[PDB]
């Protein structure tokens, strides 16, 4: 989760989201994903044009330890 000597989320650098790995930040498909149901070129199948998705390590908190990122208790 965290960076060295810190509580900020390392995966997103405290921003809470990351670049979408499927469109690679462009907001457009590159491959015929799933049998050309989501065909290449058009809207990203995952992010749907938003070019960014929620960071999985902190769930959008931007830091580790709190309720939104960590297990209860």
């Amino acid at each position: 989760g965290t960076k060295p000597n810190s509580l900020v989320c390392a995966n997103c650098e405290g921003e809470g989201c990351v670049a979408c790995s499927q469109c690679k930040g462009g907001g457009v498909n590159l491959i015929d994903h799933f049998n050309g149901q989501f065909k290449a070129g058009a809207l990203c199948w995952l992010c749907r044009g938003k070019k960014e998705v929620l960071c999985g390590d902190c769930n959008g908190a931007g830091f580790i330890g709190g309720f939104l990122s960590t297990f209860d208790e």
Binding site: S21, Q22, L54, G56, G60, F71, D72, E73
Partner: protein, 447 residues
């Protein structure tokens, strides 16, 4: 000088309340003097018979330390086990039980620190409490959901939304296949969102999602309030709307207010979800405070149908075992003494019903097989980011979570090992669910 409050030949009666204190005395003080005085300070306030002799029944309503147990890391600490007679306590009152035992001793200056690890609530005392308004069995029959844990979602952080926009989020999570949604614990009634408007729009959301799905839905409407009158007025309106479930903050409101609501819920067939805000003020530090397992027992006695227990994914060893002692302590009727899981006393609950364990925090679809394996069926899995962060929206996040759960339940029943085939089980489901496939990109599988 013989210490009359340290009585190591005393066998506890089945009617006694027994306490297990982690005592950190001042350096130089022997363990026996400290144990005697902790028994005295949680009780009469004296070792002597000077005040006692002025009374009728004398030293009859006294606590006594009946066992001492040193710990590795031994200049520090021991566990003092203390017994109190059943007559000391008002019937059906957690409030008075806490006042009597933990009212002064924590401020005892001869100690550096002190922590109540556990209580043994005797059967005879437990029969004076209602316990949970419904509990695990009765709830499942009211909801018509079996063979699986229930799924929930905290609408959070969405503080400042209209009651209608909040209601829209509620609708979507439920429609998408979750069983429950939850009010933000900070939301009671404020300028940005007044309580009666939230209840109305949450109700519309429930009826609509239930009508379209054919499955009973609920939302833990927060009736926590400044006063008992306002707490009940809010509970009554949820009842008027035919809501199946409400929530309450048992510590910040308090046990007197909670026991009232617990009784009202029994009387009106209302499920009660218990949030535990402020618990960490007391239960975090390991040498001072009250361990959560005591608060969890107190709440079971006062009454709650759900409660947050602590969430654990790993190999059920050490501090992960502590969490599962609490879970057993909340759900089972009989829990054997077991020090490796922090259970200091054997606890018979004498048919007082069990409470659903709420697993919450930063959970997501990859955690599903582990959670199902560890908690079993009688639990509520509360997703925060794990639903709402889905890049196709709330309903699709819910659908992903529901599809992941049903896949784990089918695998469990087949005979498969959820712990080591959990990754395979999710990916197999994600071939047939576009919504699950999208979730499996945001969150990363655990080793």
């Amino acid at each position: 000088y013989r210490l009359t409050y340290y009585t190591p030949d005393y066998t506890p009666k089945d009617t006694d309340i027994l306490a297990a204190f982690r005592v950190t005395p001042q350096p130089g003080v022997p363990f026996e003097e400290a144990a005697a005085a902790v028994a005295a300070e949680s009780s009469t306030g004296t070792w002597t018979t000077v005040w006692t002799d002025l009374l009728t029944d004398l030293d009859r309503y006294k606590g006594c330390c009946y066992d001492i147990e040193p710990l590795p890391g031994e200049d520090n600490q021991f566990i003092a086990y203390i017994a109190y007679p059943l007559d000391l306590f008002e019937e059906g009152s957690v409030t008075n039980m806490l006042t009597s035992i933990v009212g002064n001793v924590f401020g005892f200056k001869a100690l550096k620190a002190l922590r109540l690890e556990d209580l043994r609530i005797p059967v005879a005392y437990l029969k004076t409490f209602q316990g949970p308004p419904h509990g695990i069995q009765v709830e499942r029959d009211k909801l018509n959901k079996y063979g699986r844990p229930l799924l929930g979602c905290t609408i959070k952080p969405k503080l400042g939304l209209s009651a209608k926009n909040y209601g829209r989020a509620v609708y979507e999570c439920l429609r998408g296949g979750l069983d429950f949604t939850k009010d933000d614990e900070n939301i009671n009634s404020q300028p940005f969102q007044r309580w009666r408007d939230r209840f109305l729009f949450v109700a519309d959301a429930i009826h609509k999602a239930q009508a379209e799905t054919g499955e009973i839905k609920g939302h833990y409407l927060n009736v926590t309030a400044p006063t008992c009158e306002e707490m009940l007025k809010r509970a009554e309106f949820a009842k008027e709307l035919e809501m199946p479930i409400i929530m309450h903050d048992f510590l910040t409101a308090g046990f007197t207010a909670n026991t009232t609501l617990s009784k009202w819920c029994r009387d009106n067939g209302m499920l009660l979800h218990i949030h535990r805000a402020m618990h960490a003020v007391m239960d975090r530090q390991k040498n001072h405070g009250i361990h959560f397992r005591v608060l969890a027992k107190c709440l079971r006695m006062s009454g709650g149908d759900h409660i947050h227990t602590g969430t654990v994914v790993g190999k059920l060893e050490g501090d992960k075992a502590v969490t599962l002692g609490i879970v057993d302590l909340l759900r089972e009727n009989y829990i054997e003494q077991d020090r490796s899981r922090g259970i200091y006393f054997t606890q018979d609950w004498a048919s007082m019903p069990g409470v659903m364990a709420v697993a919450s925090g930063g959970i997501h679809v990859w955690h599903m097989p582990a959670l199902v394996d560890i908690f079993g069926d009688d639990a509520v899995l509360q997703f925060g980011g794990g639903t709402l962060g889905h890049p196709w929206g709330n309903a699709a996040g819910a659908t992903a979570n529901r599809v992941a759960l049903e896949a784990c339940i089918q695998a469990r029943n087949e005979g498969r090992d959820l712990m080591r085939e959990g990754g395979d089980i999710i990916r197999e489901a994600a071939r047939w669910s576009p919504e699950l496939a999208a979730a499996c990109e945001l969150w990363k599988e655990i080793k």
